[PDB]
DNA sequence: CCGGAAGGGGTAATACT
DNA sequence: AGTATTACCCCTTCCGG
């Protein structure tokens, strides 16, 4: 029971595996062409993913992309989360350099925080720094981000959980005013 | 490896996306009334010559230019924006002249990019009037290969004539369309009364414009919503369709809906009334049919039961259905790059200021060009009065550079006009050509004097703005559609 | 209303569709070696300026020019053809230089039109060399607005160098790629022995080319299929991938397939092997892995159980999997708009006549241009010796037309040369520029003599064709990839 | 019980109804905007319809588009065909003037001939004279959608047997027979 | 499964009434 | 829920061998 579009690695143990999450088949092809297939897995998405913070649990558990993400990860959600099942000990979100890539990264981070908080607090989530990733061919894409020896990744970390969920709520919740004030003062 | 805090990256990325979506995705520009996608599409179509003089060009080509040079986004967004700009029911004054299947007011989608062909309209030519004369600022695009305008010259008030509804992050804007003649009257008042304070100009422009004018026509009931919108920016214009009763041979009466309020989705209204009849909320209605066609326009026939009156069915339609709804107008627009809620007087003043700046920049560019032309013509005529000596020197000179030095020494000439003298054609030596040269120098000097006078006097440029906008309105003016009535 | 017979309408419509698909959809042209879509994409990249001198351009833009101007079909088909032209594993000599994700030999799809940007290649410039010099014919496009070439100049044998397999109605063609050096030798023999008969030409060209050369390399076992293809057009070239045996530190062995036959889909061969192992047809293989990467190329490693012989497993793979396949060569191509099967000598001869007529047309056009330039320069020189008379006559002329008539009278000049001396710059009045005028007149006369000489002697034309082909092949030559071996 | 893509008319009696079959939703919208909705129905398609003569019956009836055509027509196929239903007494196959339009028209004609022979025999099939998405409502109505001014080609049978031979050689699986046919009739 | 062709649907964020 | 900008994608046919 694995997602159909996932391209897995040849590594057996999870300790030396990587799951690169991309937001399209056009970027996924470039990523998988120029990857270390023995260690690195490519999971393509459909672009904008559902908002976990602005929807009910049934719908966010009905949407296809989040199902694919949790099946590729293999773990549980909320209380039934189990770290020992984790298929990849490194989930790298590799989005495009435009603002829409940042929006998709925010949506995915919100989903992970509200559903796989452990994954985040154990320091198992990374962000990659590559107008899109479908314009990059195999060689330089491998050279910058897919080469483990030279690549640089930003590891998501938690300083205070309380401020974390407070910011997540006022930024992804339904309270528009809150975020109006926030963006007005902090832009 | 370097860590990043979850909250810091979260806020950052979301604030960057939000600021981008606010400034350059959905909110209109107060000076031009256009979103960046519309601006880029219009400029590409103009630069590509798709203009009313020329024939139409495939929309796929124009979308590809917008994508390759200007807009680094999906083709579907650019195409749907173009189709919306080419939609009579969505725009009071359409900016694009389209051909093909550009949609329907109901649920029909527009044809594909390879089936529809779009050119510009005369309104779009006033939109892009004298853009190449350094009227507006230009910036490099994303890859820096080409240049695109930050704003269009906007010789007519697009933001109020067509309105702009857009959803952004944290805020949404909804400006209703107006009539061009009322806008002209308001801007004329603002130009003549350029020293008026905010309250006086607000009262004057509220007197000048009756209210929003929608392409769908219909009716507006009441005035409190329109007044609140024009005085604060946040209002609720309660709009309603048009109904009429028709008598049949057997005595049956039917309500004939010929107009619907703004942004009401056709063929969804019909399903809604059918569902309300089925489950039961709109008792009194027996049959519903759409006689709407291409040749007769929107015409919905509601055949009601015998134990029913026209007034009660009409009131039930108003209260329960979309035959009557509200336009939640919010006048949010981008000024100096930031979002602000603006009343009508602020919009008129900003448009007038933009027009004055554009006229001043155009006059400065024309004056510079005339100065260069006059300088070249002066050097050329100074060479002409010594034609025999100049010809002798050009003959005896070994090469071109020695001739340049000789001419410069002979006629106190600077290298630019000497270079022009070398390029001087032989056919220019005919007496008529020399006389034309003298008279052209005189005319260019007169134009320089006139342009200097215009630059000196602001009343002159205000007069130019008034005259050009009056010319635009008279040639592209139309009568008001929606009739404002009382409660 | 008119009654229509079912069979007549069916036959007419299907005949029209079939003829269109044969002549102008899938069957390559013998002279150009390209299908109409490829020709149109190439000419669109050329006319729009997407050439190796400058940087790349978005593929969406090029598809848009092709669709709007030349190719009135879906953008997906045009983009797929462009990507195939930019594919190394699909074309022996790629015609488009692409950037982005143009696919993989396996099941990976190419990136979208808005992500890949493509320009031409130097070989594509040899394809479109001197097209503007009336070398090739031109026709109006589908809507009759612009002109497009029926055939590209094709300065090298693209049809045989890259091959063109395509499915049509009633017929399907398949032509394998070859090596540029061997084709050069064959065409050189054809040019030198221009009077040879069909049999001797066929024997010589068969001697010149060992066999088809595929971009994927590999092996060709036997020669009966290749020989029968070259003498009849219908053959069967058995390709076989490269298989090697390696040992392991534990004593295990694993077969490494580093090369596969032509048109064999990767990532489907591997799943085919896996399914055959699961059901059980190739007993002996224990595990399958794809060590293939961007830095090592194709590498399929299948490790074998202890109680098996590498040779028997290799033969099992050859017999049951896609490791060994056959090319059903069908040398079918379009000659003067007709589908015909051709042996190799026919292809060489057709390319030879194409090159000859292209050279003749180019030289005729150059001769006409040089004669016009010589006429202008002769007029300018003959007006130049009467310089003071001409200047004095132009001065006394009230109007340019009077000066023109006076020059006609004074020098016995025609209209066009009189215009030429009228528009003559003052820089030409200098002594050095007059000397340069006379010098270039002499050089242009010498060029006219040389071009008339080229028109006179067909041996000269054959020589020019040979030298251009040799220069092209030296510029863009490569070693042979596939090794032809015995059974 | 009717296809979702079908844009039905408002008439009830089949005698004054007619179904315009188009090969695209863009052409479908263009035609529906410029039609007489009281009498004319619009049925869009998805491009090339399956080849009935080159496929098995189960695979043919599995295909969605042919099922939509059958259900919109309302009638059965083969022996159970009953002309009583015929939701529309006028089935106008409306395709573009390019070669692909002619191919789609031939495919639909062979499908109707194999599955609805009495439909074609009764003269209830018509051919139009118009890409179609480049036409708006106005000229579409003026040229071929206005009943009072339009002209249509009504499909008719003269000899059934020759029609069967022609259909078999053109749409069957005998490649060399159609090779000879297209070479002779080019 | 191969090379051109026909045609097209469907999720998601974003506020506000 | 629908309004307008955006992210993003799959899946049937025909046509020979
Ligand atoms: C229907 O279900 C699905 C499922 C998945 C899908 N995945 C991708 C695309 C899908 N569809 C796209 C389209 C419309 C075709 N586009 C017309 C066009 C014309 C010119 C150009 C152009 C595009 N693009 C440029 O960049 C410049 S030129 N219909 N479906 C699709 N559809």
> DSSP string of C344-357?
HHHHHHHHHHHHHH
The residue of chain C nearest to residue A34, with distances taken between CA atoms, is C294
Query: Is the CB of residue A94 less than 8 Å from the CB of residue A22?
Result: yes
B280 contact partners, CB below 8 Å, separation of at least 6: none
Tokens coding A173: 């919740």
Task: Mark out the alpha helices in D92-174 (DSSP H runs).
Answer: 99-115, 117-121, 137-140, 160-171
Distance, C-alpha D130 to centroid of its chain: 14
Residue whose tokens read 């079912």 = C6
Do the Cβ atoms of D117 and D161 come closer than 8 Å? no
Whether D161 contacts chain C with CB within 8 A: no
Using CA atoms, how far apart are residues B153 and C382, in angstroms rounded to an integer? 54
Bridge partner residues of C113 (DSSP): none
CA distance B384 to B413: 12
CA dihedral angle for residue A115, residue A121, residue A125, residue A129, rounded to 10 degrees:
120
Q: Please give the nucleotide, over all strands, whose C1' is closest to the CA of residue A4.
A: F10
Catalytic residues of C: 115
Strand E contacts in D 92-111 (CB under 7 A): 96, 100
Residues whose beta carbon lies within 6 Å of some atom of ligand 1: B 60, 63-64, 75, 112-114; C 60, 63-64, 75, 113-114
The number of helix segments (H) and strand segments (E) in chain A equals 8, 5
Strands A91-93 and A18-22: parallel
Beta bridge partners of A43: A21
Beta bridge partners of A91: A19, A125
Distance CA B103, CA B313 (A): 31
Q: Cα separation of C136 and B180, whole Å?
A: 55
Rounded Cα–Cα distance for residues B165 and B41 (Å): 18
Per the CB < 8 A criterion, the answer to whether D140 and D31 are in contact is: yes
Among D34, D37, D134, select the one facing B100 at the smallest CB separation. Answer: D134
- For chain A, the C-alpha Rg in angstroms (whole number) is 16
Count CB-CB contacts under 10 A for residue D152: 20
Nearest protein residue, CA measured to C1' of E7:
D47
Q: Report residue B94 as tokens.
A: 């359409």
Q: Which chains touch B (3 or more CB pairs under 8 A)?
A: A, C, D
Named by the residue before each, gaps in chain B exceeding 2.5 A from C to N are none
**B56, B64, B396: best to mutate for the C interface, most C CBs within 10 A:** B64
The secondary structure of residue C23, as a DSSP letter, is: I
**CA dihedral (C365, C366, C371, C377) positive or negative:** positive
Look at the block and give the residue holding tokens 């997906």: C76
Eight-state DSSP code of residue C459: H
C-beta separation of C28 from C151 below 8 A:
no
The SS3 of residue A178 is: helix
Residue owning tokens 């949609």:
B103
Q: Beta-carbon neighbour count of residue D177 at 10 Å?
A: 15
Confirm if B477 and B180 have CB atoms less than 8 A apart. yes
- Cα–Cα–Cα angle for C201, C90, C150, nearest 5°? 65
Pocket test of ligand 1: the residue of C73, C75, C117, C118 to mutate, having most ligand atoms within 8 Å of its CB, is C75
**C76, C50, C47: which is closest to C63 by C-alpha?**
C76
Q: How many CB atoms lie within 10 A of CB B277?
A: 17
Query: Which of B's residues 9-38 have CB atoms within 7 A of nucleic strand F?
Result: 25-26, 35-38
DSSP tally for chain D: helices H, then strands E: 8, 5
DSSP 8-state class, residue C92: S
Cα angle B377, B378, B380; round to 5: 60
Total residue length of chain C: 487
What DSSP letter does each residue of B437-474 carry, written as one string? Answer: HHHHHHHHHHHHHHHHHHHH-HHHHHHHHHHHHHHHHH
| Spatial distance between the Cα atoms of B21 and D135, rounded to a whole number of angstroms | 36
Tokens standing for B273? 């009334």
User: D65 in helix, strand or coil?
Assistant: helix
Q: What are phi and psi of C387, to 5 degrees?
A: -60, -50
Selecting from D29, D38, D135 the residue whose C-beta is nearest the C-beta of B104 gives D29
Angle at B334 between CA B328 and CA B338, to 5 degrees: 115
Q: Measured between alpha carbons, how far is residue B196 from residues B341, B342, B465, B470, C100 in Å?
A: 21, 17, 18, 21, 59
The structure tokens listed for C227 are: 């020989």
CA-based nearest residue in chain C for residue B390: C426
With tokens 């060209």, the residue in question is C205
DSSP character at residue B345: H
Question: Nearest-CA residue to the C1' of E5?
Answer: C77
Q: Are the CB atoms for D45 and B324 separated by under 8 Å? A: no
Token pair, residue C363, equals 């030289």
C332 three-state secondary structure: strand
> Both tokens of residue C52?
């190796």
Angstrom distance (rounded) from CA C233 to CA C345: 11
Question: D24 near D132, Cβ under 8 Å?
Answer: yes
Alpha-carbon distance of C321 to C260, in angstroms, equals: 11
DSSP β-ladder status, B96-99 and B117-120 = antiparallel
User: What whole-number distance in Å separates Cα of residue C334 and Cα of residue C30?
Assistant: 6
- Phi/psi at B17 (5° precision): -60, -45
**DSSP H helices in C224-340:** 224-232, 269-279, 310-320
- Beta-carbon neighbour count of residue B296 at 10 Å? 9
Residues 6+ apart with CB under 8 A from B432: C398, C399, C400
Q: What whole-number distance in Å separates Cα of residue C466 and Cα of residue C207? A: 19
3-state secondary structure (DSSP) of residue A157: strand
Compute the distance between CA of residue C206 and CA of residue C200 in angstroms, rounded to an integer.
10
The set of strand F positions with any atom below 7 Å of a protein CB reads 2-17
Q: Point out which residues pair with B334 in neighbouring strands.
A: B29, B339
D177's tokens: 């027979």
Distance CA D77, CA D63 (A): 14
Decide if A23 contacts A108 (C-beta within 8 A).
Answer: no
- Residue C51: is it exposed, middle or buried by C-beta count within 10 angstroms (0-12/13-18/19+)? middle
For B10-25, letters b (16+ CB in 10 Å) and e give bbebbbbbbbbbbbbb
For D41, phi then psi, to 5°, come to -115, 145
Residues in A closer than 8 angstroms to C292, CB to CB, are 37
Task: Tell me which residue of C121, C143, C120 sits closest to C59, measured CA to CA.
Answer: C120
At A168, list the tokens.
């997540």
Distance from CA of C169 to the nearest CA of B (A): 26
Q: Which residue has the tokens 């309380």?
A: A162
Helix C75-85 and helix C36-47, axial crossing angle in degrees, nearest 10:
80
CB D70 within 8 A of CB D43: no
Distance CA B39, CA B136 (A): 13
What letter does residue A134 receive in the DSSP assignment? Answer: T
Quote the tokens at residue C382. 């003959």
* CB within 8 Å of B407: residues ≥ 6 apart: B383, B390, B393, B413, B418, B421, B422
Task: Please give the Cα distance from A133 to D67 (Å, whole number).
Answer: 42
3-state SS, residue B161: helix
Decide if B432 and C399 are in contact by the 8 Å CB cutoff. Answer: yes
**Number of Cβ atoms within 10 Å of the Cβ of D36:** 17
Q: After which residues is chain C broken (C to N over 2.5 A)?
A: none
Does the CB of A155 have a partner CB in chain B at under 8 Å? yes
- Helical H segments across B287-430, by residue range: 310-320, 344-384, 387-396, 400-410, 415-422
Comparing CA positions, the residue from B135, B152, B33, B188 lying closest to residue B358 is B135
H or E stretch covering C392: helix C387-396
Residue C388, H or E segment: helix C387-396
Pick from B74, B386, B391, B429 the residue to mutate for testing the C interface (most C CBs within 10 Å): B429
Q: Which of residues 44-63 of D touch strand F (CB under 7 A)?
A: 46-51, 54-55, 59, 63
Judging contacts by C-beta atoms under 8 Å, the chain B residues touching residue C420 are none
Q: What is the DSSP string of C107-132?
A: SPPPPPTTT-EEEE-HHHHHHTTTGG
Q: Three-state DSSP class for D149?
A: coil
Annotated binding site of D: 23, 96, 98
H helix runs in C280-343, sequence order: 310-320
Question: What is the resolution in angstroms?
Answer: 2.8
**Closest among C103, C153, C165 to C123, alpha carbons compared:** C153
**Euclidean distance between CA atoms A112 and A124, whole angstroms:** 11
Q: Residue C338 pairs with which residues in a beta bridge?
A: C335
| Ranges assigned E (strand) in C156-224 | 166-167, 172-173, 219-221
DSSP state of B225: H
Give the orientation angle of helix A176-185 with respect to helix A161-172, to 10 degrees.
110
CB contact under 8 A, B398 and C433: no
Gyration radius (Cα) of chain C, Å:
30
Distance CA B481, CA B242 (A): 12
B261 vs C174: CA distance, rounded Å: 62
- CA dist C115 and B203 (Å) reads 53
Could you tell me if A26 and A46 are in contact, meaning their C-beta atoms sit under 8 angstroms apart? no
> Gap from B111 CA to E8 C1', in Å?
11
Report d(CA C142, CA A142) in Å as an integer: 45
| Under 8 Å between Cβ of D73 and D116 | yes
Taking CB atoms and an 8 Å cutoff, what residues of chain A touch C110? 29
3-state secondary structure of D58: helix
Tokens of D106: 């031939």
Residues B128 and B43: beta-carbon distance below 8 Å: yes
DSSP per-residue codes, C35-103: -HHHHHHHHHHHHTT--TTS--EEHHHHHHHIIIII--S-HHHHHHHHHHHT-TTT-SS-SEEEES---
Integer-rounded Cα radius of gyration of chain D: 16
Separation of alpha carbons D2 and D22, rounded Å: 17
CB C10 within 8 A of CB D106: yes
Report the b/e string of C437-476 with b at 16+ CB within 10 A: beeebeebeebbeebeebeeeeeebbebbbebbeebbeee
- Which nucleotide, over all strands, has the C1' atom closest to the CA of C25? E4
Tell me how the structure was determined.
Answer: cryo-EM
As given in the structure block, the two tokens for residue A26 are: 């056009």
Cα–Cα distance for residue pair B387/B410, rounded to 1 Å: 12
The 3-state DSSP composition of chain C as helix, strand, coil percent (nearest 5) reads 50, 15, 35
Interface of B with C in 41-60 (CB under 8 A): 57-58, 60
What are the angstrom distances between the C-alpha of D2 and each of B81, C277, D30, D69, D73?
34, 48, 21, 10, 9
d(CA D176, CA D182): 10
Distance CA D144, CA D128 (A): 7
Distance, CA of C432 to CA of C438 (rounded, Å)? 10
Question: What residue in B sits closest to D25 (Cα-Cα)?
Answer: B111
CA–CA gap between residue B31 and residue B336 (Å, rounded)? 10
Please answer whether residues A106 and B15 qualify as being in contact, where contact means their C-beta atoms are separated by less than 8 angstroms. no
Distance (Å, whole) CA C345 – CA C231: 8
CA distance to C260, C264, C306, per residue, from C303 (Å): 18, 22, 10
Alpha carbon of C20 to those of C13, C27, C339: distances in Å?
11, 10, 12
Q: Taking Cα atoms as reference points, which of B178, B187, B154, B125 lies closest to residue B470?
A: B187
Quick one: D54 exposed, middle or buried, by C-beta within 10 A (0-12, 13-18, 19+)?
exposed
φ, ψ for residue B148, nearest 5 deg: -135, 145
CB atoms within 10 A of CB C167: 12
Among B65, B394, B433, beta carbon nearest to C426 = B394
Contact residues for B348 (Cβ-Cβ < 8 A; gap 6+): B157, B160, B186, B187, B190, B201, B205
**What is the CB neighbour count within 10 angstroms for residue B477?**
12
Best probe of the C interface among A10, A27, A34, A137, by most C CBs < 10 A, is A137
Burial class (CB in 10 A: 0-12, 13-18, 19+), C419: middle
Give the pairing type, strands D40-43 and D18-21: parallel
Kind of pairing between the strands at C253-259 and C242-247: antiparallel
User: Cα distance from C186 to chain D (closest Cα, Å)?
Assistant: 33
Q: Which of C73, C92, C70 is nearest to C21 (CA)?
A: C73
Query: SS3 of A27, please?
Result: helix
């Amino acid at each position: 029971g694995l997602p159909g579009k996932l391209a897995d690695c040849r590594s057996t143990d999870p300790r030396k595996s990587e799951l690169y999450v991309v937001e399209g088949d056009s970027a996924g092809g470039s990523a998988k062409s120029g990857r270390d297939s023995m260690f690195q897995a490519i999971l393509p998405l459909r672009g904008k993913i559902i908002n976990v913070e602005k929807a009910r649990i049934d719908r966010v558990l009905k949407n296809t992309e989040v199902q694919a993400i949790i099946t590729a990860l293999g773990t549980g959600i909320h209380d039934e989360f189990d770290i020992g099942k984790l298929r990849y000990h490194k989930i790298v979100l590799m989005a495009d350099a435009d603002v829409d890539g940042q929006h998709i990264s925010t949506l995915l981070l919100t989903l992970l925080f509200r559903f796989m908080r452990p994954l985040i607090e154990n320091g198992h989530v990374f962000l990659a720094q590559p107008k899109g990733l479908g314009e990059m061919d195999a060689k330089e894409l491998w050279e910058t981000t897919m080469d483990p020896s030279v690549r640089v990744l930003r590891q998501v970390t938690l300083d205070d959980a309380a401020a974390a969920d407070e910011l997540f709520s006022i930024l992804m919740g339904e309270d528009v005013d809150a975020r109006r004030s926030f963006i007005t003062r902090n832009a | 490896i370097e860590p990043v805090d979850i909250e810091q990256e979260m806020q950052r990325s979301y604030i960057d996306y939000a600021m981008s979506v606010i400034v350059g995705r959905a909110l209109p520009e107060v000076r031009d009334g256009l979103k960046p996608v519309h601006r880029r599409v219009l400029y590409a179509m103009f630069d590509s010559g798709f203009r009313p003089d020329r024939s139409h060009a495939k929309s796929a080509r124009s979308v590809a230019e917008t994508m390759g040079n200007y807009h680094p986004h999906g083709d579907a967004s650019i195409y749907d924006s173009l189709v919306r700009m080419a939609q009579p029911w969505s725009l009071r004054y359409p900016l694009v002249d389209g051909q093909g299947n550009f949609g329907s007011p109901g649920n029909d989608p527009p044809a594909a990019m390879r089936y529809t062909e779009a050119r510009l309209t005369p309104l779009a030519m006033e939109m892009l009037r004298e853009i190449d004369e350094e009227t507006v600022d230009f910036i490099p695009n994303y890859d820096g290969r080409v240049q695109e305008p930050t704003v269009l010259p906007s010789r007519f008030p697009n933001l109020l004539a067509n309105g702009s509804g857009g959803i952004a992050v944290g805020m949404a804007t909804n400006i209703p369309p107006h009539n061009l003649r009322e806008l002209a009257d308001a801007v004329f008042w603002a130009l003549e009364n350029h020293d008026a304070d905010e309250e006086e100009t607000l009262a004057a422009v509220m007197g000048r414009v009756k209210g929003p004018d929608f392409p769908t026509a219909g009716l507006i009931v009441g005035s409190q919503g329109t007044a609140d919108a024009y005085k604060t920016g946040r209002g609720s214009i309660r709009m309603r369709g048009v109904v009429e009763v028709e008598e049949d041979s057997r005595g049956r009466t039917s309500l004939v809906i010929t107009e619907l309020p703004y942004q009401v989705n056709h063929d969804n209204f019909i399903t809604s009334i059918a569902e309300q009849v089925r489950d039961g909320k709109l008792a009194g209605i027996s049959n519903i049919e759409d006689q709407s066609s291409d040749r007769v326009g929107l015409r919905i026939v509601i055949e009601i039961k015998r134990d029913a009156v026209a007034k009660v069915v009409i009131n039930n339609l108003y209260k329960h259905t979309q035959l009557q709804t509200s336009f939640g107008a919010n006048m949010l627009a981008i000024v100096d790059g930031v979002p602000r809620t603006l009343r009508l007087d602020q919009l008129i003043r900003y448009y007038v200021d933009h027009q004055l700046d554009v006229i001043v920049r155009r006059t400065t560019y024309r004056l510079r060009k005339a100065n260069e032309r006059a300088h070249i013509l002066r050097g050329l005529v100074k060479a002409l009065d010594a034609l025999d000596e100049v010809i002798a020197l050009i003959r005896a000179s070994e090469t071109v550079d020695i001739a340049r030095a000789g001419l410069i020494e002979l006629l106190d000439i600077d290298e630019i006009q000497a270079q022009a003298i070398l390029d001087m054609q032989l056919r220019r030596l005919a007496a008529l050509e020399r006389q034309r040269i003298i008279d052209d120098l005189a005319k260019i000097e007169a134009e320089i004097a006139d342009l200097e006078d215009i630059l000196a006097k602001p009343e002159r440029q205000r007069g130019i703005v008034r005259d050009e906008l009056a010319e635009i309105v008279d040639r592209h003016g139309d009568d008001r559609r929606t009739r404002i009535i009382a409660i």
